[PDB]
Amino acid sequence: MDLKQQVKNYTMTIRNTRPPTMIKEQDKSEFSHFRALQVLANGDEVPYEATLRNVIHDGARQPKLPPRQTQKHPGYIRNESGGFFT
Amino acid sequence: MFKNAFQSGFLSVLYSIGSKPLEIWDKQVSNGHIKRITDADIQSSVLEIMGQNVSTTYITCPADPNKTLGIKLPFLVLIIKNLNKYFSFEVQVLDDKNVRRRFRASNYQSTTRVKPFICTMPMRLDSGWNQIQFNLSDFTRRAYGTNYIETLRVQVHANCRIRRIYFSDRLYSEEELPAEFKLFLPI
Amino acid sequence: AEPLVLNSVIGFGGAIENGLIAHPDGRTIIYPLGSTIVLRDRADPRSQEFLQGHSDKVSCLALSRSGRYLASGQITYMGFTADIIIWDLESKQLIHRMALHKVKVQALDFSCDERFLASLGGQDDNALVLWDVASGNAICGSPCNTNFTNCVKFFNNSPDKLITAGNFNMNVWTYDAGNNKLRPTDATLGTLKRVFKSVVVDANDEYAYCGTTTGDVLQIALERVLFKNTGPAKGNVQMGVTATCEVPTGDILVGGGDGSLQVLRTVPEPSSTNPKLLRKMPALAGTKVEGAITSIALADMNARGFTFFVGTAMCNIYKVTYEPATSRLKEELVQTAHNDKINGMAFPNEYSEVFATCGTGFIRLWHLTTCRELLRIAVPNLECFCIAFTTDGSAILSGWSDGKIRAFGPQSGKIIFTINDAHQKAVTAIASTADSSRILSGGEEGMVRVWRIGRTSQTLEASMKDHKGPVNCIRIKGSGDECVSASSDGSCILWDLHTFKRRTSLFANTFFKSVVYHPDESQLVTAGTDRKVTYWDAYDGNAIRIEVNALAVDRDGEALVSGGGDKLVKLWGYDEGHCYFVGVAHSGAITAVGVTPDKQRIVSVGTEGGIFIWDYQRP
Amino acid sequence: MREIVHIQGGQCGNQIGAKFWEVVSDEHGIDPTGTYHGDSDLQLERINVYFNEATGGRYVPRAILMDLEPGTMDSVRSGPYGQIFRPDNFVFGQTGAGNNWAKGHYTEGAELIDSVLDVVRKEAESCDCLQGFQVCHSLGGGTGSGMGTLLISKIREEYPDRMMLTFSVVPSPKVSDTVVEPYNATLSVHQLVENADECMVLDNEALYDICFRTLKLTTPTFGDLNHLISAVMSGITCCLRFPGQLNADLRKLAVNLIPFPRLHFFMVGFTPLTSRGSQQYRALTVPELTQQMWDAKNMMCAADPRHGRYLTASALFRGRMSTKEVDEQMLNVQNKNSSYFVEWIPNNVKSSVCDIPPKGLKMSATFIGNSTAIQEMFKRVSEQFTAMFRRKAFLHWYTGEGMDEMEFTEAESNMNDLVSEYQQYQDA
Amino acid sequence: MREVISIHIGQAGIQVGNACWELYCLEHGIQPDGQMPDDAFNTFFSETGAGKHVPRCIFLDLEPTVVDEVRTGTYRQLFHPEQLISGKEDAANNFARGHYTIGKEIVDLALDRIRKLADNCTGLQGFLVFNAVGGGTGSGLGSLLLERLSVDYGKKSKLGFTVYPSPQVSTAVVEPYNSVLSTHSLLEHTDVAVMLDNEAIYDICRRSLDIERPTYTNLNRLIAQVISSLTASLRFDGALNVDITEFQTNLVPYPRIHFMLSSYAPIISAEKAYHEQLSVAEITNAAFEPASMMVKCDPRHGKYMACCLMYRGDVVPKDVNASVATIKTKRTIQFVDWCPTGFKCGINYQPPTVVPGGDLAKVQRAVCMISNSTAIGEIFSRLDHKFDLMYAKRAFVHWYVGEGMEEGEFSEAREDLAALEKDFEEVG
Amino acid sequence: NGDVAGSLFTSTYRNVKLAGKAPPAANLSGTGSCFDTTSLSPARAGAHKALDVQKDELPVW
């Protein structure tokens, strides 16, 4: 439609052509973590952060608003004729 | 890039008015400066680039090499102020045969000389603000006797004040142009 | 009987500002938990001594000089008084229990003389009160102002004046001798409106340093309280200054709400260009730690520099060794703890050395012999429920409050699959088959489903088993093929899963939380609201009937271990039914319990944000 | 897209603007340093409506701060959220306004507009698709009224197609902190009617009651009042910023509320509003939010709805809810109080809805109503004006700036013409 | 060979599309990433060079704030971004802004998207519009578009599923204006047009599925079911296969009269599905229930000019012949003299597929009843009333004349309705 | 072009108050109140200053 949206669409087309490979969007020390764990298994002396590994995902936006409960108490409201809601 | 898009009547690649005009453009400065200032004649914003050593201060249209600006509109129009300095700009073209020509226009040059890959030509700029239109399809036919397919890259060197860069697909008149695609110089 | 040795406890009170303390010239680290205080050895990360005297939750912590007794505040319910408690040291028991501050306690501190202890009311009832230590009685009291103060500090010398800062106010109060009054003097700052958060006083009462939500570190003189210098030059702290402390050399450690920990040397300097003007505070050293910094305590090593114990909002404890000789600041991560409300426990089948904890932010993995958590698979916003290991040793299943199940692996890499819309909202219980060929998901909107799972292709079948309420727990016989679904209606249902025809079993007296098979038997044990550990018959019967939430059994039915809303852990000779080897001191609603199959260890975890380890002995 | 530029005139307008920019800066989760530290992506999708990018990942507001007597501009700079403004988005003069609408609109206004217009043009062109403007007046003082209107008239003849809002604080009917206040009110109105599209009217007196009865505040300072103006000013635009099952741009709010070009003085209200005690007992449902908003107390203007009928109204919800409930609630209200609406307008409420609620809350709403009750406000002023103008009190100051008497007589008659139109459509 | 082009104009249009294109990928196993693990999907897809299936749809809108949500939703891997059109500015509930000033500049774009999409289809059955009358985009633009379509094809068939402004529940104050204008222009262009409204479906969720909190997402799932059962024969086998041509010839006896109602059955939850048998007689009776309609019209206030039935699941042709005989026996239902027949039925053997997270339950039978009844002219009489009820005051007209329109179109849109209304009376 | 009289005061205020920028350090020696005449120094402005570098800091070749 316009220059900005055409650049947007081209980038999105590239994103769709490429396989997302279910990626995790952050890569920490994989083999360093494995090596540190093997060092812990026998040598029994490894730094704590060396033992640690961290992995992140997208999760979602929308930062956990509390539930609406979608439903009252089944003593106040009745369907049309006497009858619970489901 | 700009492939599988829609170009029918106009295609604006650069506009001084916007949140970020150099979205797609790469900018390289060595002894110069780029900024956006409010012009006096056309009382609006114009993106100005200046600096010594014209051949080094410029902006390329595709963000990086190995990426082409696929655009098939014949006419190309720029809206520039004439600062009475050395100003030049270059446009690369793909012919019907897979050969990338390139034409450039300079205001410090006086003779045109066709070459296998280049065509330098003088430009007779007016005073102050003016829009310049390139056929860009008559040029390829007149130089190499071939047909125009699609532009690949655009590049504008130093000592100029840009307001509009747009492909037109035909020579529109001052009437047919919309409000944004014209020169309205106020009092 | 209470023989149960407490081998390990992992936890930390994250957002309790200034909660972390180090014993002055001592070998103990003091920090709060859900409702208790913990004194760990400074070196041996096993010797813990816990102090439990509060009812709801510790809120503030203060420790007098000379390793003398320490005070602990408390949060309470809406209209019931708080409870400041003074805990002795060299005996480690209660001394005084003072009650005011009807909403909560905001700040506490001892004077340089250990005779005075000042308190600060909550958001409501915000007043400044002084207490005597010999008699646990209030000497003086006064309401500060409408803009509620945040932190208070006794002067290092002259234990008769104290400075307090808050929203848009700073004051210095001096305790009058002729009466029970204390007179304030307000702070005069040039057209400055700063939300002071942390306040520190130098050794000689010269300059009071005060952090700010804007990010400045205002240093003011204290003879007259007027303002002197703004804060860190060459920039500004990102999330505002939160955890500020002083190094004995005269410099200041500053930690913002992003993890920026830096050292500002605060000596009144003249501005180079303009001589009659001062500079801003420069920054000697700087570093980045993970999470907002909330508490800083000192440890004089004196070899090169100083080691500061830094507690961050992410429940991580750091050891920041800084030496001003070469201006070198290196941090180490001593201990990590979960954040809050650990939801689910999981043991890999036939493995009693590593386990996994699903929490409200992401999944962590720990092991038996040491805390030393292995990894933290993060999902940003929505929380995990009912972590599970696929049988025989395989992937980790996790159903989230989104209503979607996701699978991870050992290194957990990238998401094995995402069964989305697995329920309406907030899948709650998840189980797998003994063949790892189907997965049961009981959602919160009273439904049960099962998904067939191939090797690389998933199968979304339409079981749609309708239940009467939220599914607290789901179990399946590892011997054959069956299913049990508990409920927030307690009507535990036996599903056949050969025909999916809901073998008509129903148990209705209250609503249940945890059901377990007897290993290789037709028995059942269920736990719900009312105290009920009733043994059922798989053949529609009830063998016996004897606030509980979690149950577990051994290899064979030796010791049924149980816990619930009550803060205890009850072990039972299953066949006999006696409550031998009962454990205490789990400050909160315990949520899950595990048996560590191969070995004799009971892991307990609750909403407090901590994890406990006990041994296992049955008569 | 839909970017909006924001102007603040007068001391009050510069002060509430310090909150509006502080509330929003926290909504999208940016710092007083101007850096972003939120968590979601909705903090970034439509951030450009309120900010321009900056070097180093900073965000600065698309704001303009105009006021004579730069003493006030040191205050907002010194506040905890002054470090986000570009220190060249500050136009000022050493001379005072003096509450003389004339000099604020004739002598010392004409000296600055050429500079202000230079600044607004600069960041009018910083927007890809500029949606509209919005200001913050104070119809009492000389800066707000005098400079604001002169600025507005300039914008209108430059950006006719665009839309101009106005969160003008009206004088109080009972309270008059100044003495020449009715002179500043009437003279400004003679400008707004022809040179605006939507004009919220707000009075501090109603803001004191709302803070007194509902919020149970003991000492409402001007911050709390400003804290309320900030709340609503954010509620108007959440459609432009956040996803919504029925989004409402500002131009579609206009056409749904002003059937005639002149009846563009609105009446605003916010909900939920409770103390700290009542917050524990009240439950947050669509019913609570709509009865509270439809109450005659939440109206922050000094006007009684029951003395008029709603030509049109509009409610904006934000918070995960059910659209059916809000659809029938506005129906029932339209049925019962059939005397409080008109007949030639079949359905005279619009119920927009957004998907993202406020920061710490879970459900919220905002009430906007174009009732004929506001005609009371202008009636009152038109007396205090004609009271002293009958005696030519304080008028020599106004002749001191090249003005005349025709300017007043024309101005007063403009209101009497206006309030006459509010009666025609109020058939009692 | 048998494919359709599904357009979605306006917010409600693309919202409903976000449910239809949610249902179809599940009906055919298409993963959200374009590719499943012939002719069963070609009607709604087009296999690429390898693997992916793109949905042969078009998502058009002037409000960016909702199309950009699909652009980031889970269903972005399905759509090539060249489909999803947007716009810097919207229509703001003005028919003129949608039809005259803004809509004029993007039709040429979409017309090329269609031309790039019709050429891929070998046998173009017909277009499939999702208009949402009551807005600026759906009414102003959608009408401008269909004009540009009939000049290209003419002989082709243009369908339509237009949500109509409900009588009681309405979220716009001016929508009686644009609605009339839309119909005055779409009528002579389209050839058949399904009609429905929101409240009629709100009740159905309360009566039948018994959900007290229905949102726009619930109604959208039910519009998804209507179309699937309609278009199944285009993509599935079954006795009495139905095609749009044979669907259209025997349902619109006169060129002007093409509006019609809709219905669907069974509509029950899961628990109500186990205490039933759902005989073909039950459904055809529930389908003919005036309360099960999707439009707030009274069929018993008129007759049936023609009716149509698309069953689904396990049916045999004799029972329909039996059940339809039972229906022609009852007296509540009327038929005009000049139509002895009026039932063109149809079967498919593919059952209805339920979506996880949906409100309906799994059923092996279903019926979708469409019928052109002369009773529908009453709801046209409402809009017939409210228009002159406001046009008498010339309210809001300054927007329309201010946006490239004049009074002529109103009067000219007026006469067409009175002429259309009498046509419904000439059949008796 | 534009005037120079007005711009200067507003600029100085915007620089010194609004930003944390410096005056910077305008020497006011010899000048007291507004009443006492200053004692004019014999120095001259824009004067090139001699080289202050030490003897030995000069490296040897």
Ligand SMILES: CC(=O)O[C@H]1C(=O)[C@@]2(C)[C@H]([C@H](OC(=O)c3ccccc3)[C@]3(O)C[C@H](OC(=O)[C@H](O)[C@@H](NC(=O)c4ccccc4)c4ccccc4)C(C)=C1C3(C)C)[C@]1(OC(C)=O)CO[C@@H]1C[C@@H]2O
């Ligand atoms: C435990 C809890 O829920 O506390 C609430 C709270 O109790 C109440 C009383 C809050 C609280 O508000 C006040 O106390 C208050 C005081 C003077 C004037 C106005 C409000 C609250 O401050 C307000 C605050 O609400 C917000 O943060 C809103 O999203 C609001 N925020 C701000 O205005 C704001 C901006 C910058 C810095 C701080 C706050 C908002 C509204 C519209 C658009 C954007 C943001 C929250 C949740 C609370 C407290 C803290 C007590 C109330 O305010 C709002 C707007 O939520 C007062 O009436 C509501 C009802 C809330 O229940």
Ligand SMILES: Nc1nc2c(ncn2[C@@H]2O[C@H](COP(=O)(O)OP(=O)(O)OP(=O)(O)O)[C@@H](O)[C@H]2O)c(=O)[nH]1
């Ligand atoms: N059944 C159903 N109706 C909807 C939905 N969303 C909106 N509507 C109704 O559609 C009408 C307005 O649709 P819009 O698309 O927002 O209006 P528009 O055509 O875009 O015109 P502008 O608002 O000016 O851009 C209103 O009556 C809505 O109640 C939905 O999700 N489902």
Ligand SMILES: Nc1nc2c(ncn2[C@@H]2O[C@H](COP(=O)(O)OP(=O)(O)O)[C@@H](O)[C@H]2O)c(=O)[nH]1
């Ligand atoms: N909500 C709010 N209103 C204020 C505040 N200060 C002043 N007002 C009102 O604004 C009016 C004065 O306008 P002012 O801008 O100070 O004078 P001006 O410079 O000539 O325009 C008076 O009616 C004040 O009561 C404030 O801090 N908050």
Ligand SMILES: [Mg+2]
């Ligand atoms: Mg719309």
